[PDB]
Design an enzyme around this catalytic site. Structure first.
Site, PDB file in Angstrom:
ATOM      1  N   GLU A  40      -9.858  -3.799  15.058  1.00  0.00           N
ATOM      2  CA  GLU A  40      -8.697  -4.530  15.541  1.00  0.00           C
ATOM      3  C   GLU A  40      -8.330  -4.137  16.970  1.00  0.00           C
ATOM      4  O   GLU A  40      -7.655  -4.899  17.644  1.00  0.00           O
ATOM      5  CB  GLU A  40      -7.453  -4.351  14.643  1.00  0.00           C
ATOM      6  CG  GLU A  40      -7.666  -4.892  13.270  1.00  0.00           C
ATOM      7  CD  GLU A  40      -6.405  -4.709  12.408  1.00  0.00           C
ATOM      8  OE1 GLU A  40      -5.237  -4.818  12.925  1.00  0.00           O
ATOM      9  OE2 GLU A  40      -6.622  -4.325  11.248  1.00  0.00           O
ATOM     10  N   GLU A  50       1.706   1.736  13.087  1.00  0.00           N
ATOM     11  CA  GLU A  50       0.538   1.730  12.223  1.00  0.00           C
ATOM     12  C   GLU A  50      -0.511   0.816  12.835  1.00  0.00           C
ATOM     13  O   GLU A  50      -0.509  -0.400  12.607  1.00  0.00           O
ATOM     14  CB  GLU A  50       0.884   1.348  10.773  1.00  0.00           C
ATOM     15  CG  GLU A  50      -0.301   1.602   9.829  1.00  0.00           C
ATOM     16  CD  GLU A  50      -1.201   0.398   9.654  1.00  0.00           C
ATOM     17  OE1 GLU A  50      -0.821  -0.494   8.851  1.00  0.00           O
ATOM     18  OE2 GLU A  50      -2.259   0.341  10.339  1.00  0.00           O
ATOM     19  N   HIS A 106      -5.551   0.275   1.233  1.00  0.00           N
ATOM     20  CA  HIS A 106      -6.135  -1.011   1.607  1.00  0.00           C
ATOM     21  C   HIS A 106      -7.221  -0.878   2.675  1.00  0.00           C
ATOM     22  O   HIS A 106      -7.888  -1.866   2.990  1.00  0.00           O
ATOM     23  CB  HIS A 106      -5.023  -1.985   2.049  1.00  0.00           C
ATOM     24  CG  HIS A 106      -4.514  -1.745   3.454  1.00  0.00           C
ATOM     25  ND1 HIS A 106      -3.764  -0.634   3.812  1.00  0.00           N
ATOM     26  CD2 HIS A 106      -4.669  -2.468   4.597  1.00  0.00           C
ATOM     27  CE1 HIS A 106      -3.484  -0.686   5.100  1.00  0.00           C
ATOM     28  NE2 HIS A 106      -4.010  -1.793   5.599  1.00  0.00           N
ATOM     29  N   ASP A 159       0.885  -1.166   0.000  1.00  0.00           N
ATOM     30  CA  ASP A 159       0.000   0.000   0.000  1.00  0.00           C
ATOM     31  C   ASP A 159       0.923   1.216   0.000  1.00  0.00           C
ATOM     32  O   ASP A 159       1.464   1.630   1.043  1.00  0.00           O
ATOM     33  CB  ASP A 159      -0.926  -0.009   1.212  1.00  0.00           C
ATOM     34  CG  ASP A 159      -1.889   1.158   1.242  1.00  0.00           C
ATOM     35  OD1 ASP A 159      -1.662   2.207   0.623  1.00  0.00           O
ATOM     36  OD2 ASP A 159      -2.899   0.989   1.896  1.00  0.00           O
TER      37      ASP A 159
END
Ligand SMILES: Nc1ncnc2c1ncn2[C@@H]1O[C@H](C[C@@H](N)CC[C@H](N)C(=O)O)[C@@H](O)[C@H]1O
Ligand SMILES: Nc1ncnc2c1ncn2[C@@H]1O[C@H](C[C@@H](N)CC[C@H](N)C(=O)O)[C@@H](O)[C@H]1O
Ligand SMILES: Nc1ncnc2c1ncn2[C@@H]1O[C@H](C[C@@H](N)CC[C@H](N)C(=O)O)[C@@H](O)[C@H]1O
Ligand SMILES: Nc1ncnc2c1ncn2[C@@H]1O[C@H](C[C@@H](N)CC[C@H](N)C(=O)O)[C@@H](O)[C@H]1O
Lengths: 342, 344, 343, 342
Positions: free
Chosen positions: C132, C123, C280, C31
């Site tokens: 997440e 990240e 993404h 990405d």
């Protein structure tokens, strides 16, 4: 010892002049109609640069360029040729009734004696990627015979470099190398040699043509001025480049071609081997990277192409390229004396 | 204590039964017309194997196969399902007015308690390459409830294997791995991981279909007889093979498919996932070699496909293949749990 | 640990297995907008890195840690809980950086760092920013941050905006109506049609779209990573009042997010907005169960409530009303199981 | 050394540079007929290798030495003169065979080997068997062979047969007639046409062909490698008498070769005949200067005289006549510079 023999391995010189002693190889260059016809146009349209002049033809081969100089009115043409083709050129001089104007001198231009200085030198000394064969050095050397303010036909040479994308070519060469990846070729593990095989295959410049749409940036130009350059200038040729990428994608390597210009008194005539122009026997040359660089449109691809002349009448090529925005860097080494004719 | 929990990691089981609790996933299986229509034909065309009988449906999902058994006249159907789909099956049993014949029993078949022994077990427990999901073990385990001289629908399963050539597929996977060959990705040398990346990509079985003209020899067949096999027989599955090569060229791997047979009193009905037959949601499976083997027509390619069951409800596959005439040998490891779904 | 207490083991195992694949690390690495913007943010703020101590929370392949090294960092602690930690160590060695990057395998909630750091890089963004729950790990890591240390990224902005998309809405019933048939192979499926509709509507839709489907200027909810605590992300209440720029049927709310790297030299932004090149992360759409008619100049007011769950995700509750009519709709969505629609 | 004395230095440099390329070793290795048949001959005669001492003359990548090891050889001396010797050593180490294979860099005529061997293996065959003159190195190596030892291959058969190929014959004139024009860009080239013809005819043609061009059963000339001395290959006089099976114009002689591995268990043949799958040797054709009309049942007799030269090749002198008519033709060809027509 001559300057030629000092820079050339005997084995190389033997094979080189044996190659050009074949009539079939002279035929092959003669039948390149772009080449031969463009040389004829350069000489005849600049007939005043030849009229009543003394000419030197460096490496006359069949004699064809000396015949063009005679057509243009030259008074005397010294046609130097080191291979046994010199004897065949003499046969044509006699059968064309030009013994009064074309004088074949058998031998290397670095070794023969001429009776007088000349007004203009003509030669076709260009190899693949312009510099292969190292005959431009013989052409420059011949300037010891050139009068002050004499001319050179061709006068300048431009090498063009441009990045290209071609996954098909890349995978074709990688596929050949992967033979040496096999862990059980007839029961033998070859994989310890995979690295050496990749190196060898990717050292081969690819000689063929391609669609211009594979170029990812405008070409960068490197100009050699044959009126000004000295022999020694071609021993180590450093070509820096900064490309402004016009397309995003994988850069698989750099593509090379060349143009020469005949800068005559009446007009300038160009002989181009660019992929936008009709094909010649030089085609074009591509130097693959062992792994492609990714770039976006608007990025800059910076680096250097370093050409080191070697004693096998060719060049050791080092290409280092970097995508400036990401620091993605590729360093590659190529042997111009082992091209892949694709 | 349950044989299911003893062979399954909890993480795997949770995800597995969550997946089958989605109505969209039941619909995907139900809408495979070859699968569902062949099951219905096998059951209805063998209706005398169901008429007034006691049936166990192992992993009933929506209930669909138990509805077929009821259409064939079964007296009582125990429909066992471990996912939350069990509650939707109950809804359909009530809405279809079959509460007197289909009894949903939520739970794992290894853990529930059935009220009585059954005349016939029906199930669709086949995964990719037949064996993925390890649900065949649950199907065989359920035979603790089967009367002697009971029957199993399906009764046998055939795995087929054949060598294939497909340089495009091979190059597609190698190209992905080639990312990890870069010596300067944003200035970072990744190439020390190139070997690990090639192994990871080539560990993925490829699930899609293909033209039968890529096959280079007639298939070898390995048969599991569900009436005879014991659960433990599927912990280690060793499939030897010798192919007589019909074409020269590069062998890039082995292709796999499977057929099951419903061996009824009236007729035997076959459900095939072969690449010569209409496509199913199982497609076909191809296991690539990291380096292809060259063979000439008439050579023999011999070796073993070994499947070792793992606690993630799948198998670790080792394929070793040799061209007998030259000793060129390829050894490969595949993780059946994590295939590459290539179809589009 | 703080991690194990908030995460079902079953979810944790699958999560770290996923990131243990080189192919999934590769997906993030390739990405270019993501990776390139991180590199630019770090290199163009080199004075935030030169001769500094860095922590990389979830280093994956190590790529952000190598960027910190390119920018001159003295020492980088690269923490990673998947088996990718072994591959990162291989790259540190092969890149001749063992003297500057120390790979620490394990969860950032569970390892020990030998010293405090000047800056944390990570990240940790998921779909809709918060999926997440890795932002909590990023905040948790501030126990290792010196006072006046920095966070890269520094802030995260989630954007919400109402959209019209008649075909996306109708698509849910097209799919669910598989169940509305009275004789599927002899079986009446119709009693499950409502459950199937519900299941489809509970899936946030991951894909991109044309910005012209948006019916109002987005509302923004900002997390300041320098100030926020982990617990601030357990319950995220986003009130909204949209001033409708176009008349039509509102079918749901579209979501995207930006992060900013607020360095000493400059601020660099990474945007996943539908006006920017695709990442993404795509964008995310949550449908309303019933569309709402609004006219240009009406106001659409309500709440998006995100409630963290132990599957490393969020239960999403959206309720909205058109203030001028009282027309009201809601929906409950499960962010863990999105529908990947992009084609 | 014996090698130096018979080889021009410039030829040897080019020769061993060629074989130093992994791509040229791969070319031979990937010839499945060649490599698979060597493996078959060695493995199926395993009692000729088990616990034996072996010499591999010109081991290249080492591939034939690995076969000898697969067959159970006790120790293998693998001699290689090109820089490929370094790559063979890498493979010996990576295949865990340093206890069984020793790589000896250098020419087999010049290196010191310590002990006599039971069997010598080699692939020394060139175009029409003898090109490259490496069979002489193979025979020279018998100084290291025990009196009871064996040679793999054991015999080599060169085959000759007359052919008709009107289009091949006429092609020479089509190409040479480039020179037969009076104004090629203004130049009369015609005086060189005969020299161009002569040049083309002096090149053996390397390519394959349909067996239906052959006009008689081949004549074979056998070299028994167990019996021959290297001096036997300096001058190879091959008489022939062909019993014509077809009437037509005979344009030249076609050449191919077989070798046989005569082992204790079985004889294995490697054939490059045009009736067999193609190998990297193709086949070779030498034109007569003029075709000869022969009827079925006529006899075509003469000699093919191969005279070795210091360029690691042969001058090929062919004379032929139709006995029943007395019609005669000949040619003299240079095998070092064939025309690759395929
Ligand atoms: N140093 C040298 N001295 C003399 N002849 C040379 C030298 N280097 C190369 N040649 C000859 O230069 C020729 C180069 C050819 N490209 C040109 C042939 C001819 N001028 C033509 O344009 O058709 C060959 O015939 C070489 O044998
Ligand atoms: N051990 C088990 N015990 C109970 N249900 C299981 C077990 N293993 C798998 N299942 C269920 O078995 C079903 C398998 C499906 N392939 C078939 C569904 C349904 N019988 C149909 O044919 O459409 C899923 O719904 C699984 O959740
Ligand atoms: N609590 C945690 N402790 C350590 N690593 C974690 C934790 N949660 C997630 N990770 C890892 O964090 C990584 C997050 C990725 N989005 C980023 C990878 C890498 N830093 C990159 O930018 O390419 C994954 O490799 C996860 O395995
Ligand atoms: N006099 C010599 N001494 C040593 N090696 C030689 C000599 N002449 C040729 N060679 C090598 O012999 C090899 C001949 C190849 N035809 C065979 C390579 C290898 N044995 C194979 O069968 O694939 C080349 O690698 C040459 O470099």
């Amino acid at each position: 010892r001559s300057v030629f023999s000092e820079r050339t391995e005997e084995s190389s010189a033997v094979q080189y002049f044996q190659f050009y002693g074949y009539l079939s190889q002279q035929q092959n260059m003669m039948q390149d109609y772009v080449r031969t016809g463009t040389y004829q146009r350069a000489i005849l349209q600049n007939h005043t640069d030849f009229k009543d002049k003394i000419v030197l033809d460096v490496g006359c081969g069949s004699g064809i360029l000396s015949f063009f100089a005679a057509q243009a009115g030259a008074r005397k043409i010294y046609a130097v040729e080191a291979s046994t083709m010199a004897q065949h050129a003499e046969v044509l001089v006699k059968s064309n009734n030009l013994t009064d104007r074309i004088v074949v001198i058998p031998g290397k231009v670095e070794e023969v004696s001429l009776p007088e200085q000349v007004d203009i030198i003509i030669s076709e000394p260009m190899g693949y990627m312009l510099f292969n064969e190292r005959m431009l050095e013989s052409y420059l050397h011949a300037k010891k015979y050139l009068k002050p303010s004499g001319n050179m036909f061709p006068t300048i040479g431009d090498v063009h470099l441009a990045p290209f994308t071609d996954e098909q070519l890349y995978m074709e060469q990688f596929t050949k190398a992967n033979f040496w990846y096999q862990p059980s070729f007839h029961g033998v593990d070859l994989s310890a040699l995979r690295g050496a095989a990749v190196d060898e295959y990717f050292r081969q410049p690819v000689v063929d043509t391609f669609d211009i749409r594979i170029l990812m940036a405008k070409s960068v130009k490197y100009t050699v001025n044959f009126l000004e350059a000295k022999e020694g200038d071609l021993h180590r040729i450093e070509i820096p480049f900064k490309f402004h990428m016009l397309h995003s994608g994988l850069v698989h390597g750099l593509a090379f071609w060349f143009d020469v210009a005949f800068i005559g008194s009446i007009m300038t005539v160009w002989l181009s081997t660019a992929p936008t122009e009709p094909l010649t026997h030089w085609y074009q040359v591509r130097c693959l990277f062992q792994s492609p660089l990714f770039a976006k449109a608007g990025d800059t691809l910076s680096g250097t192409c370093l050409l080191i002349a070697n004693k096998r009448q060719s060049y050791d090529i080092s290409i280092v390229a970097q995508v400036d925005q990401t620091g993605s860097k590729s360093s590659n080494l190529l042997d111009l004396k082992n091209p892949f004719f694709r």
